[PDB]
Amino acid sequence: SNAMQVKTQSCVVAGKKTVAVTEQTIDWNNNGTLVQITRGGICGSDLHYYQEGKVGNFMIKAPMVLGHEVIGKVIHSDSSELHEGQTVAINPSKPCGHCKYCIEHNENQCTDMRFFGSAMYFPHVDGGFTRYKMVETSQCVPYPAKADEKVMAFAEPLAVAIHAAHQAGELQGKRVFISGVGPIGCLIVSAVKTLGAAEIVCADVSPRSLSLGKEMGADVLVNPQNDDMDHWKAEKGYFDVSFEVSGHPSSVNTCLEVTRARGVMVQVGMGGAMAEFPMMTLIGKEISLRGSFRFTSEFNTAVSWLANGVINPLPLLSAEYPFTDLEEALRFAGDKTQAAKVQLVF
Amino acid sequence: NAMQVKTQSCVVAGKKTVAVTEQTIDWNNNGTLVQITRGGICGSDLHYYQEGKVGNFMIKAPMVLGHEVIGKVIHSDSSELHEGQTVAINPSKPCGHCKYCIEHNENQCTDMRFFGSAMYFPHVDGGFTRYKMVETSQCVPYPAKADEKVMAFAEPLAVAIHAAHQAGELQGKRVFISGVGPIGCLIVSAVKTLGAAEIVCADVSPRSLSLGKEMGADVLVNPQNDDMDHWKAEKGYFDVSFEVSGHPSSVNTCLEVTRARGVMVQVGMGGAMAEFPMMTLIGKEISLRGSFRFTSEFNTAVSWLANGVINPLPLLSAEYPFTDLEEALRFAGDKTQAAKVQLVF
Numbered sequence: 001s002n003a004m005q006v007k008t009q010s011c012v013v014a015g016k017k018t019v020a021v022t023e024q025t026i027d028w029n030n031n032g033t034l035v036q037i038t039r040g041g042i043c044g045s046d047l048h049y050y051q052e053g054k055v056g057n058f059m060i061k062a063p064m065v066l067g068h069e070v071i072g073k074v075i076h077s078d079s080s081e082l083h084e085g086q087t088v089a090i091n092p093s094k095p096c097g098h099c100k101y102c103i104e105h106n107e108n109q110c111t112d113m114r115f116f117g118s119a120m121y122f123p124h125v126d127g128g129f130t131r132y133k134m135v136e137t138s139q140c141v142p143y144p145a146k147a148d149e150k151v152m153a154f155a156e157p158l159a160v161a162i163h164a165a166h167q168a169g170e171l172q173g174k175r176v177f178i179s180g181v182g183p184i185g186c187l188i189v190s191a192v193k194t195l196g197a198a199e200i201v202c203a204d205v206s207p208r209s210l211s212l213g214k215e216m217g218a219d220v221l222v223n224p225q226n227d228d229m230d231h232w233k234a235e236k237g238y239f240d241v242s243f244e245v246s247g248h249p250s251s252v253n254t255c256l257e258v259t260r261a262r263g264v265m266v267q268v269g270m271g272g273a274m275a276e277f278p279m280m281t282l283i284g285k286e287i288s289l290r291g292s293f294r295f296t297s298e299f300n301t302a303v304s305w306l307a308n309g310v311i312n313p314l315p316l317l318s319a320e321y322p323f324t325d326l327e328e329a330l331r332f333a334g335d336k337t338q339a340a341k342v343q344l345v346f
Numbered sequence: 347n348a349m350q351v352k353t354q355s356c357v358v359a360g361k362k363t364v365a366v367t368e369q370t371i372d373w374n375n376n377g378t379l380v381q382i383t384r385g386g387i388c389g390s391d392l393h394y395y396q397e398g399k400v401g402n403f404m405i406k407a408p409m410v411l412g413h414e415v416i417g418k419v420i421h422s423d424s425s426e427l428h429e430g431q432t433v434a435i436n437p438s439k440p441c442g443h444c445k446y447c448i449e450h451n452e453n454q455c456t457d458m459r460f461f462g463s464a465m466y467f468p469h470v471d472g473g474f475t476r477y478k479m480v481e482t483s484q485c486v487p488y489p490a491k492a493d494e495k496v497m498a499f500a501e502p503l504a505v506a507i508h509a510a511h512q513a514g515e516l517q518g519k520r521v522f523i524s525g526v527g528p529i530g531c532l533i534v535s536a537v538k539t540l541g542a543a544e545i546v547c548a549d550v551s552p553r554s555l556s557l558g559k560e561m562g563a564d565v566l567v568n569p570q571n572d573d574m575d576h577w578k579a580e581k582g583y584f585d586v587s588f589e590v591s592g593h594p595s596s597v598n599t600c601l602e603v604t605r606a607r608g609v610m611v612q613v614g615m616g617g618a619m620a621e622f623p624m625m626t627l628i629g630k631e632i633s634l635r636g637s638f639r640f641t642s643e644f645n646t647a648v649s650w651l652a653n654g655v656i657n658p659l660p661l662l663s664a665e666y667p668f669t670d671l672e673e674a675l676r677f678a679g680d681k682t683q684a685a686k687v688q689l690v691f
């Protein structure tokens with residue numbers, strides 16, 4: 001437990017298409033929890049930092065560690081409940097405890113938020129793609145070591161999906177439409193299935209994303225290019241709830257035409273500012289458009305769902321790459337034709 | 347007592363083409379025959395005369411205008427409606443068998459008939475007529491002691507109450523109302539009665555802001571002259587925001603001013619809104635709800651006006667006889683001089 005300076009190799013981005021694993025140094029001192037990272041997933045936030053060196057308007061001004069969905073083992077902890085060698089999933093959220101949104105238990109909307117691998121503030125918060133990382137004790141969520149290492153790495157994306165399902169309101173016995181079955185969309189499929197949806201219909205252009213959608217629990221699969229949607233759009237819509245995850249303006253219109261009047265449409269996917277929104281369709285049908293952003297307490301639920309085998313995300317795991325060949329993994333994850341979820345092994 | 351009686355109607359046939367015509371109905375003792383005594387000019391009637399279309403619905407055949415009218419019962423097939431009874435005419439006639447009507451969402455009725463709406467073919471005739479035969483369920487009685495000028499606000503108040511109910515819980519909340527026209531002012535009075543703790547309205551015209559103060563608004567705001575930084579700090583200030591004007595800049599201010607996970611009720615229609623900041627709605631998780639017409643709040647609006655829950659007379663700008671139809675529509679389209687204009691029959 002003695003205060004020591006441990007070494008680590010961190011996945012670091014410096015700019016647009018500038019990426020390298022560098023030497024680093026953290027000085028541990030009996031405050032917080034020292035965690036050896038074992039596995040981490042590549043999200044869309046990480047690809048944007050490598051492809052364009054930015055997310056939305058947030059640019060990278062100094063080198064930063066990537067990754068925000070990360071699991072590992074405990075090495076040292078200031079809490080006696082967290083034993084050494086314990087398998088934990090790292091919650092990338094570290095909010096303050098005194099702002100108005102965190103007081104109301106809406107920690108996902110914290111004013112002084114510090115998310116893993118987020119270039120929102122400067123200096124940016126370093127991510128989890130590193131061999132050793134010192135983290136807060138409350139950010140360590142234990143799980144039984146018998147759980148599959150490859151399954152638990154889906155803790156953060158599942159939390160994003162579970163939170164998106166709760167933004168829909170009542171789901172028991174409802175008819176759910178899920179436009180865009182990427183990694184997040186497929187986890188929303190299994191989320192609404194577990195939460196009691198009576199019929200899940202999902203749509204995507206690539207049949208590969210549809211093939212993954214049926215394996216995650218979908219009942220009907222539609223391709224907007226080929227199949228016709230007119231019987232879904234009949235009598236002011238058919239579905240109680242719609243999930244827009246692709247972020248494409250074409251898919252947003254269909255969700256409005258497909259959702260019944262006074263229905264709920266959960267906006268998950270982000271694709272800039274939509275440039276021609278049918279606001280008249282929203283007013284006429286009284287649709288309840290609700291946004292979804294990250295998660296609050298659904299991270300502990302996702303760790304429980306994955307450990308107890310409620311859902312099985314392994315069909316989404318496309319490939320594994322050692323953390324030393326990091327750029328090759330970023331190039332492979334950006335290819336949407338072959339990679340759904342790519343994990344880094346530490 | 348079958349009878350044929352003549353009537354005068356306020357008919358539009360195209361853009362700017364407006365005339366008062368003579369018509370003849372055939373009252374065969376089914377429904378209820380009423381003499382319309384007073385009617386209010388709404389934004390739909392102006393859009394039909396200013397450009398011949400509401401949104402994307404053009405006027406193809408001549409149509410009677412108006413959907414905010416009151417009157418007295420001439421004859422009725424029900425013994426409960428005594429002749430001469432003052433009534434407010436509900437412009438909605440929903441079916442009783444569709445999906446949304448069974449679930450008590452008749453404002454979203456698949457087979458809906460609304461006064462003076464070009465959404466259907468043939469268009470449903472409006473209420474701007476000296477005599478009109480209507481369904482008995484569309485007649486809502488009110489005590490004859492009530493003011494005729496006050497009860498004419500029944501339809502726009504019913505729209506405001508329905509919009510306030512889209513907000514969810516309003517007791518002790520901080521509401522922001524962007525666009526404080528006639529509908530916006532009635533929303534000010536609605537959430538005030540429903541228990542809003544603080545009402546802040548915003549508009550460019552100082553005349554409309556002066557009307558909002560009399561309707562119960564706590565703080566008045568001109569969005570260009572006043573600094574709105576205080577209400578945008580910490581990802582927003584107000585629990586609920588009411589977008590009523592329809593301008594994109596007003597939509598943007600409501601998104602920045604509403605706190606995260608707040609409610610934004612969209613009332614004003616202003617075309618397929620372009621350059622919509624969807625990223626702001628995602629990051630803050632604002633619940634954007636739409637409000638369309640009304641359902642059961644029409645009976646509530648008639649009861650509010652008959653018992654003086656809210657007095658809408660500060661919104662009445664001018665009274666015109668229905669003979670000077672095109673004179674009133676020209677005066678109603680002038681926002682500098684008019685808020686709500688009434689036609690008397």
Ligand SMILES: [Zn+2]
Pocket residue numbers: 095096097098099100101102107109110111112113
């Ligand atoms: Zn906070």
Ligand SMILES: [Zn+2]
Pocket residue numbers: 440441442443444445446447452454455456457458
């Ligand atoms: Zn119906």
